[PDB]
Design a protein around this ligand. Structure first.
Ligand SMILES: CC[C@@H](C(=O)O)n1cnc2sc(C)c(-c3ccccc3)c2c1=O
Length: 133
């Protein structure tokens, strides 16, 4: 029951400062422009201790599966090869990605009927708000 309130299908309804966040992570111009237009569907499911997060859009379809606290290899949508660890901290899903001596943190939070995604790299944050599909 660890992620019960996160499970579902969610659709992107707002974004703020995502272009600048992508710049900070190193995404190139053309990818930023095309990816920034996407309106992904985020599909979160749990089966035993394994959590799966899928993101489907015209830009790219991605999928990660993981166990909380257990590091895994991820190829991000912008093709970084990162080491990811996802934990639950006080009801917030906290995803840290490490690569090339850099780090970024992506937090997912349930707030009212929304799922709010906050990602941060150095001082640059973006907030992406999802609602139930
Ligand atoms: C929002 C934080 C984080 C995440 O959703 O887990 N996250 C982090 N970095 C990047 S770079 C990039 C190109 C996407 C991206 C993926 C699919 C569709 C559009 C953009 C992305 C991303 O989605």
């Amino acid at each position: 029951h660890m992620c019960d309130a996160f499970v579902g299908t969610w659709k992107l309804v707002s974004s703020e400062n995502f272009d600048d966040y992508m710049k900070e992570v190193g995404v190139g111009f053309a990818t930023r422009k095309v990816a920034g237009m996407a309106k992904p569907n985020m599909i979160i499911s749990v089966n035993g201790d394994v959590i799966t997060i899928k993101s489907e859009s015209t830009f790219k379809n991605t999928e990660i599966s993981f166990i909380l606290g257990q590091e895994f290899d991820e190829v991000t949508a912008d093709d970084r090869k990162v080491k990811s660890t996802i934990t639950l901290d006080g009801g917030v899903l906290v995803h840290v990605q490490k690569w090339d001596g850099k780090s970024t943190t992506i937090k997912r939070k349930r707030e009212d009927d929304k799922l709010v995604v906050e990602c941060v790299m150095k001082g640059v944050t973006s907030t992406r708000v999802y609602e139930r599909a």
